[PDB]
Design a protein around this nucleic acid. Structure first.
Ligand SMILES: [Mg+2]
Ligand SMILES: [Mg+2]
Ligand SMILES: [Mg+2]
Ligand SMILES: [Mg+2]
Ligand SMILES: [Mg+2]
Ligand SMILES: [Mg+2]
Ligand SMILES: [Mg+2]
Ligand SMILES: [Mg+2]
Ligand SMILES: [Mg+2]
Ligand SMILES: [Mg+2]
Ligand SMILES: [Mg+2]
Ligand SMILES: [Mg+2]
Ligand SMILES: [Mg+2]
Ligand SMILES: [Mg+2]
Ligand SMILES: [Mg+2]
Ligand SMILES: [Mg+2]
Ligand SMILES: [Mg+2]
Lengths: 129, 153, 150, 141
RNA sequence: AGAAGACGGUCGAACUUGACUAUCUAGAGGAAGUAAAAGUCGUAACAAGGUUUCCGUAGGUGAACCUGCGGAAGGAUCAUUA
RNA sequence: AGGUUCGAAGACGAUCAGAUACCGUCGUAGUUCCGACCAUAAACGAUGCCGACUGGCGAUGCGGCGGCGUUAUUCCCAUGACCCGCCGGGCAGCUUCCGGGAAACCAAAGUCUUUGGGUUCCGGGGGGAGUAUGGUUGCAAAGCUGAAACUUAAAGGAAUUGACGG
RNA sequence: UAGCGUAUAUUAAAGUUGCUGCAGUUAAAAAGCUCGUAGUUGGAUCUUGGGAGCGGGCGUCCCCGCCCUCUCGGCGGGGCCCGAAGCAUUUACUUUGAAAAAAUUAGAGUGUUCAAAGCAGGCCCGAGCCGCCUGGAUACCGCAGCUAGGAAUAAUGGAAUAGGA
RNA sequence: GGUGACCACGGGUGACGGGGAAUCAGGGUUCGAUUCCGGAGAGGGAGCCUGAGAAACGGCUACCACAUCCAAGGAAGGCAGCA
């Protein structure tokens, strides 16, 4: 009934960012969510975040900065080769100057610039700009 | 029950049974010698093939087939049709336009030697390619792996 | 929502964060197991044993006291029920509806509800078959189910 | 919505072809009823023999007599009606002449105020109709 | 050493007959749809269209249609008072 | 089985140029019950189901929790009637530059070129036509599945101004 | 413009077939309603920061080396050493390596007099010069199969009547 | 026994397959009888001889369909090779 926790997390982030809010509670937590948020936070689009440990799946309270436009997900995790990364960059990103595609590779969860740097492909998680 | 259930005498062609059995031997117990071979590719000969008494001329260990070509795998679905079973091989077929997959399957009939005794539906078998053994059989069972079992009620 | 109802109800138990046994509970693990054994020999289900132990003995969760769960304790003692209790109760309800329905043949609502109950029985039995709790040849037969239940 | 699953290619492709049968052009091209019904049989032109000279009244609000001919094709000898376009070009065509006939522009659809006419005459017996109209050549007499 | 020839077997064209199947085609008569309408008869619908309209079902009548039983508002009422 | 009342068909009386109608009088089948068929409705919210997020407000129905007081038995604690709130699940309402939409409008019909949560059914200009034919279900009436030839340049939706309205 | 018109098939236009990427209140379009098997999809959780020198600057960034196993090591028992065997699941995925005819396509070189082409050509001769230099590359070749690294994501497996290591 | 809603079996194709061709954001939609590779056939079916190799057709035998010469007893045919 909830097939994707990353999709719902990024939708909640997107909706509350569009409403002008300053913090978001992301209700079910997972480490894919944490790695995605760590990429987004290292690139400067969101602020600090805090994981709340109950003995079920946790919760995350994210601090927003006002620098986020759209953080959507790609609904099947399509397997992407390095040859095809340009095509996804053109379809998904608003320009060649900013915006990132988050892949999961065997080297970890990372943005597409780092994935081209480390000469690896993987499955696409989502985008943000 | 016995192995001689056919109209012709069943024997391994490379074993001479009438080797001048004289008074210096015991009557009994005598046990006629068994021909078996080691197939390559790191596949162990089962012990039931070593001291079994079956005669099977299409058995990869005690018969006249040689394994060469492709090594495949599948799941047992039918165990009728004596000394032969039907396995199912599932796979995903890529379709470029929708850049997604679809699920396909193929059955092949394989020869199951009687050195594999406890084989059930749902078991995973390893098959090796041999020469054509019948109209539709081209593979031969080399190894049987049980699936989620080994414990019963 | 519900499997076979249009209900989006949200009511359930909220287990607390602290898993430690409270200091006021002067009951160790083995005598709590003995209470479990007594109640199970009295003919109670694990739900009922947990309800009684919570209501009038101070044991909020036996998993935090003993270390494992009620049905595991009963199985280790060798006196766990032969059918799972939820499948048992579903079959009991099906038998009640079927008996009512054969004396009242114009109840089309009960016919609809019996269809729902038996669908739930079959889904549950398929699950228990995959987990080897039921024999693989087990089958809910309506004609012989009443001799199994109540 | 549509199914997006990674293993849903068969559902997507089967649905697409089942739904491709629902547009007019794909069905017209791929069913074969239209190819059997039209007199040219997939050809672009055809030869025939004039049976009589007719005039068809134009559709309202226009008012004229459009000069046509009744033509029976040499292969598959169906009978069609073909327009004879220009100001005096009907007088060139004599009865029992042997014309070439083309489409009239809209791929088997009627054109203009001429009701039910899908063909036009090009090259009444072998001298072309434009050369006859422009005086370039004359009837082979 | 052996040719013609012959009994049998085996492949088996072809012909006759029968069935099935696909395509194309004749037909007294009947019943439609499009048109060209610029005829005759009425006025069913669009306004409360002069009986509010429409759906399902059933019967009836030159024709549009009418009537019965349930339903809808896409109604001509978002409303009617202790 | 039963048939009170209504009342398709039918008869008559009116009205009308006509009136197989509307109005009036009578009246069959039916309407009612039991048993068996039929599977259709503007069977409608003309809005698939499951899940998440995104404003405010006042009510209402059920359950629970908590509070000044009033009232009942009874004199007390309950328990009912009311009053003031909170939580959950419902049927709805008002309001809003959330956002959307061709607009009417819609807190979902939003979170859509900044386009991907899962999944089923289904449309592809108007007609011909839900027709022909084959199949299949039914006692029938009919239901389901379902073309083509041919024809046509618009048919439609929502709003605006006028004109007209028994 | 030495060419231009017409007929027809087909592609773009067509986000009017929609995977990317359309629609379904009122425009055409959600099955009357519920159950249900294939099909499709399915919650969270098991290794992470300090680690070893080269280390995009131990410079609190880090090319990057992580501070799998053992029976013969073959450079019955000495340090200089490395191979015979196997993988503590098996897959998908990703990167690499082999193999995928030529032609065609992309593309390097080369003044066909330019070009479309072609696969050719270029340099000294005061003449023995009894001739010298150079090319005829490279890429791409879906899926399936083979191979070697990674191991996040997704599937899967091991001890519960212990028939466990 | 074997196969099948992961579409068997049957029917159609104005279907020889492929390398490739047209279109041209990315996706895709159409086309490929046609000089290279593979297949198949020599009017239609069938059967053979010889040879390493053919079920050969610029080999033979037979039937069917066309068809040539004849003194009417017979005889000879095969352009989907180049013209
Ligand atoms: Mg959805
Ligand atoms: Mg009316
Ligand atoms: Mg009227
Ligand atoms: Mg009216
Ligand atoms: Mg009356
Ligand atoms: Mg009735
Ligand atoms: Mg249409
Ligand atoms: Mg197109
Ligand atoms: Mg559209
Ligand atoms: Mg509509
Ligand atoms: Mg299912
Ligand atoms: Mg998961
Ligand atoms: Mg052909
Ligand atoms: Mg070809
Ligand atoms: Mg060839
Ligand atoms: Mg041949
Ligand atoms: Mg031949």
């Amino acid at each position: 009934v909830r097939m994707n926790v990353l999709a719902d997390a990024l939708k909640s982030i997107n909706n509350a960012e569009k409403r002008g809010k300053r913090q978001v509670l992301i209700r079910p937590c997972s480490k894919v969510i944490v790695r995605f948020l760590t990429v987004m936070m290292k690139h400067g689009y969101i602020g600090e975040f805090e994981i709340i440990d109950d003995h079920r799946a946790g919760k995350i309270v994210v601090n927003l900065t006002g620098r986020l436009n759209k953080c959507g997900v790609i609904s099947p995790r399509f397997d992407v080769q390095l040859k095809d990364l340009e095509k996804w960059q053109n379809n998904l990103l608003p320009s060649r100057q900013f915006g990132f595609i988050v892949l999961t590779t065997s080297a970890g969860i990372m943005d597409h610039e780092e994935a081209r740097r480390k000469h690896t492909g993987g499955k696409i998680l989502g985008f943000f700009f | 029950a016995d192995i001689q259930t056919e109209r012709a005498y069943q024997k391994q062609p490379t074993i001479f049974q009438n080797k001048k059995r004289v008074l210096l031997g015991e009557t009994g117990k005598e046990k006629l010698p068994r021909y078996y071979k080691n197939i390559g590719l790191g596949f162990k000969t089962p012990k039931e093939a070593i001291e079994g008494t079956y005669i099977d001329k299409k058995c990869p260990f005690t018969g006249n087939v040689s394994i060469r070509g492709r090594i495949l795998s599948g799941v047992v679905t039918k165990m009728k049709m004596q000394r032969t079973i039907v396995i199912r091989r599932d796979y995903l077929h890529y379709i470029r336009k929708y850049n997604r997959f679809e699920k396909r399957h193929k059955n092949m009939s394989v020869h199951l030697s009687p050195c594999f005794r406890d084989v059930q539906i749902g078991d995973i078998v390893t098959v090796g390619e041999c020469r054509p053994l019948s109209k539709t059989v081209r593979f031969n069972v080399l190894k049987v792996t049980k699936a989620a079992g080994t414990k019963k009620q | 929502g519900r499997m076979h109802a249009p209900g989006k109800g949200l009511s359930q138990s909220a287990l607390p964060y602290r898993r430690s046994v409270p200091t006021w509970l002067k009951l160790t693990s083995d005598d709590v197991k003995e209470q479990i054994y007594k109640l199970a020999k009295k003919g109670l289900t694990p739900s009922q044993i947990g309800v009684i132990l919570r209501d009038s003995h101070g044991v909020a969760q036996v998993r935090f006291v003993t270390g494992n769960k009620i049905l595991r304790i009963l199985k280790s003692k060798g006196l766990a029920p032969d059918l799972p209790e939820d499948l048992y109760h579903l079959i009991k309800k099906a038998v009640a509806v079927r008996k009512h329905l054969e004396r009242n043949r114009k109840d089309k609502d009960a016919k609809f509800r019996l269809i729902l109950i038996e669908s739930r029985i079959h889904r549950l039995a398929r699950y228990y078959k995959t987990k080897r709790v039921l024999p693989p040849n087990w089958k809910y037969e309506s004609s012989t189910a009443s001799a199994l239940v109540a | 919505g549509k199914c997006r699953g990674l293993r849903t290619a068969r559902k997507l492709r089967s649905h697409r072809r089942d739904q491709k049968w629902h547009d007019k052009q794909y069905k017209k091209a791929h069913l074969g009823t239209a190819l059997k019904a039209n007199p040219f049989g997939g050809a672009s032109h055809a030869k025939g023999i004039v049976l009589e000279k007719v005039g068809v009244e134009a559709k309202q609000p226009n008012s004229a007599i459009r000069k046509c001919v009744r033509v029976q094709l040499i292969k598959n000898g169906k009978k069609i009606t073909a327009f004879v376009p220009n100001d005096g070009c009907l007088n060139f065509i004599e009865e029992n002449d042997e014309v070439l006939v083309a489409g009239f522009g809209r791929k088997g659809h009627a054109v203009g105020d001429i009701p039910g006419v899908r063909f036009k005459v090009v090259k009444v017996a072998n001298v072309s109709l434009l050369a006859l109209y422009k005086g370039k050549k004359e009837r082979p007499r």
